[PDB]
């Protein structure tokens, strides 16, 4: 089951993602992004996206539906 | 059991008061049945005729089973 869950996470980090600008980090595993659609969202960050690299105003792909930063 | 039928009615009254849904209604009916099993005392069911009468379909089945 652990392997299945890992595979599901790897999947939700999918291909058709939407580009956007990560604007800042609000808390752990959540942050504000502005999608190239022109709207700003308060989305949830997946785990282990190198929060060290995740600096304000950074290009990031977003889940097409949930807008989660993945 | 009838000689020692030291049952408590206030808790059942409180449950009845707090009930809103048919699920909880049949739950109270069954709980009364359990608290009165083998006592042949249907005082709650003979007092709350409106409550007992708000049952429908298989809830009436369950209420009669509670009587039994």
């Amino acid at each position: 089951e652990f392997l299945h869950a890992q595979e599901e996470v790897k999947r939700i980090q999918s291909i058709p993602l939407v580009i956007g600008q990560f604007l800042e980090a609000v808390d752990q595993n959540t942050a504000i992004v502005g999608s190239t659609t022109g709207s700003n969202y308060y989305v949830r960050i997946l785990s282990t996206i190198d929060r060290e690299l995740l600096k304000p105003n950074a290009s990031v792909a977003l889940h097409k539906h949930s807008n989660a930063l993945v | 059991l009838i000689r020692n039928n030291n049952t408590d009615l206030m808790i059942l009254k409180n449950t009845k008061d707090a009930v809103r849904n048919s699920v909880c209604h049949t739950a109270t009916v069954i709980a009364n049945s359990f608290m009165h099993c083998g006592t042949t005392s249907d005082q709650f069911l003979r007092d709350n005729l409106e409550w007992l009468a708000r049952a429908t379909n298989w809830a009436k089945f369950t209420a009669t089973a509670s009587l039994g």
């Binding site: - | 030291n6 408590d8 069954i30 359990f34 099993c37 083998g38 298989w58 369950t62 089973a65 039994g68």
Partner: protein, 68 residues
Amino acid sequence: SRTGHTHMPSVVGVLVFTQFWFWFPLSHFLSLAYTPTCVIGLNKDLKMPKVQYKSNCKPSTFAYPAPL
């Protein structure tokens, strides 16, 4: 049972009651699993005489819950 024998009505009642997840009316089958915790003295005439049983314990470890 009191002597250790498996109580068939009780086990059947508990099983069928557990089978209420699929059908509420069967929830009353737990009635079969209710056994009176009674010690009843009978004399030769098969009639219950007024006896006085004596238990050596505090009258709070086995007393009825008080009305609230």
